[PDB]
Every structure is written in C-alpha cells, then in structure tokens.
C-alpha cells in the first residue's frame, strides 16, 4: 500500500508516535517520505547482506529476521515480512524500540539527512488530525 501524506500522519498519530521520545509527528512522516516514499512494500538491499524493509525501512541485521542476513540479532523479535504489511502496527511498534535504543531518530539515514533541522510541521499542515 502507498499512503497519502495526511492519511499516514493520522495513522501514526493513532499509534502514538506524536512526540514519542521527544519527536513530533512531522518528524515521523518526513522520515517515511524519504525512506520509502510512503510505500509499505519498499525494500532495499545493502552491501553487508542486510535488507531494509517497509515504510520505515527497518534493517534485517539488527531488528527483524529475514533468514538470509548474517549476524542478525532480531531485536524487535519479528519476521521482516511482517513489516511489509498494509497495516503499519508492526513497523510502528518496532520503530518505538529502535528510537528508544539511545540514538533517537538518527537510526534513519534519510531523516538525519533530509528532515532533521527542517520545518517538519510542514509535513502535517493541511491535514485533519
């Protein structure tokens, strides 16, 4: 599924991401935009043999198990396939564990490079929240 900007903002707010660990809703919507372009089925393979899965591009080396990644730790205790669902619950729940890791949203490259320090409120303006 490909979410619309406002539709995703509402979905994330419903799952308690607004202001979670100090990150306003706009930060999360911005991260999903540049990480997966709002596509729940986006996947990207990396040089270390790991793959990033879903709307928040969660990595198979540390967070989910896809059975083909060496040195996987599966810290979210979930199969990576669950992160490709149309319902973002699994991805959100795992993201909450990642951001609580101790490095905030820097776990998301696209967020660090294109969201951090910008007017992230722009991502929720015009939306009915």
Swiss-Prot record:
SMART domains: LYZ1. SUPFAM superfamilies: Lysozyme-like (SSF53955). The active site is at residues 35, 52. Disulfide bonds join 6-127, 30-115, 64-80, 76-94. Its EC number is 3.2.1.17. Its main location: secreted. In the egg white and polymorphonuclear leukocytes. It catalyses: Hydrolysis of (1->4)-beta-linkages between N-acetylmuramic acid and N-acetyl-D-glucosamine residues in a peptidoglycan and between N-acetyl-D-glucosamine residues in chitodextrins. Gene3D superfamilies: 1.10.530.10. Keywords: Allergen, Antimicrobial, Bacteriolytic enzyme, Disulfide bond, Glycosidase, Hydrolase, Secreted, Signal. GO terms for molecular function: beta-N-acetylglucosaminidase activity; identical protein binding; lysozyme activity. It is found in: Secreted. Substrate binds at residue 101. It is an enzyme of class 3 (hydrolase). GO terms for biological process: cell wall macromolecule catabolic process; defense response to bacterium; defense response to Gram-negative bacterium; defense response to Gram-positive bacterium; killing of cells of another organism. Belongs to the glycosyl hydrolase 22 family. This is Lysozyme C.
């Amino acid at each position: 599924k490909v979410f619309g900007r406002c539709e995703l903002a509402a979905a994330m707010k419903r799952h308690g991401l607004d202001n979670y660990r100090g990150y306003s809703l706009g930060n999360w919507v911005c991260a999903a935009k540049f990480e997966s372009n709002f596509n729940t089925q986006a996947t990207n393979r990396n040089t270390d043999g790991s793959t990033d899965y879903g709307i928040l591009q969660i990595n198979s080396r540390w967070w989910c198990n896809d059975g083909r990644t060496p040195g996987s730790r599966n810290l979210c205790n979930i199969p990576c396939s669950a992160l490709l669902s149309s319902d973002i619950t699994a991805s959100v729940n795992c993201a909450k564990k990642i951001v609580s890791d101790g490095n905030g949203m820097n776990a998301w490259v696209a967020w660090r490079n294109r969201c951090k320090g910008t007017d992230v409120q722009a991502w929720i303006r015009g939306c009915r929240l």
